[PDB]
Amino acid sequence: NDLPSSFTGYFKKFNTGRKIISQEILNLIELRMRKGNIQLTNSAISDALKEIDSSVLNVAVTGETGSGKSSFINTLRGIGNEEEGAAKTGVVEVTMERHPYKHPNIPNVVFWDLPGIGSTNFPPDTYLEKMKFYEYDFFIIISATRFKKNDIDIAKAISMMKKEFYFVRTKVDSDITNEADKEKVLQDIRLNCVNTFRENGIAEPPIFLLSNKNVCHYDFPVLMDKLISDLPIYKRHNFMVSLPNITDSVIEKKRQFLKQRIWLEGFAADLVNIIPSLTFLLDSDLETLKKSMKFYRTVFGVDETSLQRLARDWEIEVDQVEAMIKSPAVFKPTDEETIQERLSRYIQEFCLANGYLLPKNSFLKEIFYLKYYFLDMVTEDAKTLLKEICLKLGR
């Protein structure tokens, strides 16, 4: 129940697949805290954060023309082929150049649309050299059918360089519709794929059947979860926040990663022995808080632009969508109450329901309790809209 134990003890609420930082680093930080190395302690936390924040992810998306590379890239960034930044889909024209696509709101996440190896006449290894294989964190190998020798030869060349790769079977929704009017058409699809793999001399590998048109369906959710799990721990945060907000589970998962960063950031800023009251609101902390709110809102898809997007799909005024959630009104000017009074209330509300999160008389600085409050609010808003977005589908 001492401070060092409370610091590491906080991460016990998140399982190994949801850790933003390794147990070895946490133990090392706790050791330094217990040894009294205040310098080394803040240095280790600060370095951990810098490594988390600066992590850049480069995903290589390959597969033959028509597989769904461009669509996959759009789907992962949560954008339509129409939106700006989209990787145009249905492009048949041959190309020999890789094309980068950054997540619209997370610059540190970059997807590379690589031309199918078949489109080029490059042998597996030359293809990888030409595509600069060394720049990628992992490869997504897409097939809309049952995979072919080219896909496996690329994977074999990738494993030989000890890089991660995932076999993704797209268009399952097509096979389902074409074989109907759901059913285990998936079972057969997966079966044909395994035969192709066994056929190419390898043990049955993991296969993700999915539809770029329905991110909430099939193996898309487990794939996104597996990508995060397999990623070196420090890279998880940045990629996790860029992922599609498909279910309450994924939303909660984003919240868990964000809560851990607030905690690290809070300890890095130094704890205090004064209760959080926000008697005064510095303009600097106010600007920081406004930036945190905008970031959280963007991450969970409840930012201005996103709410505007929903204002389209739903033939209603943006004002009405905003009325459905809470985060949009936090910084909306009002003559009836100052921002300081509002944030002071939030802190009191937060600490009453959550406590101070630390041993008696130890507290995080006020701005962090506000970040936690903002995070819960936005995550709630996200679940609210998602509830409507999905159920309103009907298909």
Ligand X SMILES: Nc1nc2c(ncn2[C@@H]2O[C@H](COP(=O)(O)OP(=O)(O)O)[C@@H](O)[C@H]2O)c(=O)[nH]1
- Contact residues toward Mg ion (CB under 5 A) are 69-70, 91
Stretch of residues binding ligand X (CB under 6 A), selected from 25-33, 59-67, 150-158, 258-266: 59-67
User: Can you give the three-state secondary structure of 369-386, one letter per residue?
Assistant: HHHHHHHHHHHHHHHHHH
Q: Is 63 annotated as a binding residue?
A: no
Using CB under 6 A, pick the residue from 212, 242, 260, 379 that binds ligand X.
212
Measured CA distances, 329 to 119, 336, 381 (Å): 51, 13, 12
Handedness of CA 142, 144, 146, 151 (dihedral sign): negative
Among ligand X, Mg ion, none, the one that 86 touches (CB under a kind-dependent 5 to 8 A) is none
Is residue 67 a contact point for ligand X (CB under 6 A)? yes
Among Mg ion, ligand X, none, the one that 164 touches (CB under a kind-dependent 5 to 8 A) is none
Is residue 91 a contact point for ligand X (CB under 6 A)? yes
CB 141 within 8 A of CB 166: yes
Is residue 150 a contact point for ligand X (CB under 6 A)? no
Please give the residue whose beta carbon sits closest to Mg ion in the complex: 70
Number of residues that bind ligand X (CB under 6 A): 18
What counts of helices (H) and strands (E) characterise the chain? 16, 6
Q: By CB under 6 A, what part of segment 329-388 binds ligand X?
A: none
Measured CA distances, 81 to 73, 75, 89, 211, 362 (Å): 10, 9, 6, 15, 50
Q: By CB under 6 A, what part of segment 285-304 binds ligand X?
A: none
User: Closer CB to ligand X, residue 68 or residue 221?
Assistant: 68
Could you count the other beta carbons within 10 Å of the beta carbon of residue 97? 9
Using CB under 6 A, pick the residue from 55, 71, 143, 238 that binds ligand X.
71
Measured CA distances, 211 to 16, 67, 201, 247 (Å): 28, 11, 27, 16
Nearest approach, Cβ of residue 282 and ligand X (Å):
49
Binding to ligand X by CB under 6 A, coded x per residue (else -) over 160-179, reads: ----------xx-xx-----
Among ligand X, Mg ion, none, the one that 211 touches (CB under a kind-dependent 5 to 8 A) is ligand X
Structure tokens at 336: 């009836």
CB 110 within 8 A of CB 59: yes
Using CB under 6 A, pick the residue from 90, 333, 355, 394 that binds ligand X.
90
In angstroms, the CA 114 to CA 94 distance is: 11
In angstroms, the CA 288 to CA 215 distance is: 33
Q: Is 298 annotated as a binding residue?
A: no
Among Mg ion, ligand X, none, the one that 67 touches (CB under a kind-dependent 5 to 8 A) is ligand X
**Residue count (the chain):** 395
Binding residues: 66, 68-71, 89-90, 171, 173-174, 212
Binding interface with ligand X (CB under 6 A) = 63, 65-71, 89-91, 170-171, 173-174, 211-213
